[PDB]
Ligand binder design. Sequence first.
Ligand SMILES: [Ca+2]
Ligand SMILES: [Ca+2]
Ligand SMILES: [Ca+2]
Length: 151
Amino acid sequence: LTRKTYFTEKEVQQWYKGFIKDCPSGQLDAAGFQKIYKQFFPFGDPTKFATFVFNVFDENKDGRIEFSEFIQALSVTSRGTLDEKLRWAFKLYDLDNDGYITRNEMLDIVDAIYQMVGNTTPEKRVDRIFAMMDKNADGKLTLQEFQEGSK
Ligand SMILES: [Ca+2]
Ligand SMILES: [Ca+2]
Ligand SMILES: [Ca+2]
């Protein structure tokens, strides 16, 4: 009985039917996630990125994606406003969950993105956007620095 999500509730209904359709156990864990990413990027190694994305999906950090976490992710990512979408992206970068994005963290992401695709540089690229987004130049990005930098 969500409705705390951009879905109608003859929409939660399909998404659940689809959920137990894909994953009948009702719990897809890191391993399953990791392999479908292997299918999603068969010209690279999605392992690093697959993990960062899985970590944002699994909000209570138990190592499983329940429906609540799956259906909220979809809502935000597919239908939420730009801020809400950027807030979700922010969590992905913020690996240690301390509320900032640092240079090596963002480098890690760019490195993950670079690794997942890479046969068909991260360093110079991150310096570019961080210098761009980091207005006060403290070496950290706040959500606000990130949201505005992106827009
Ligand atoms: Ca969970
Ligand atoms: Ca951080
Ligand atoms: Ca800053």
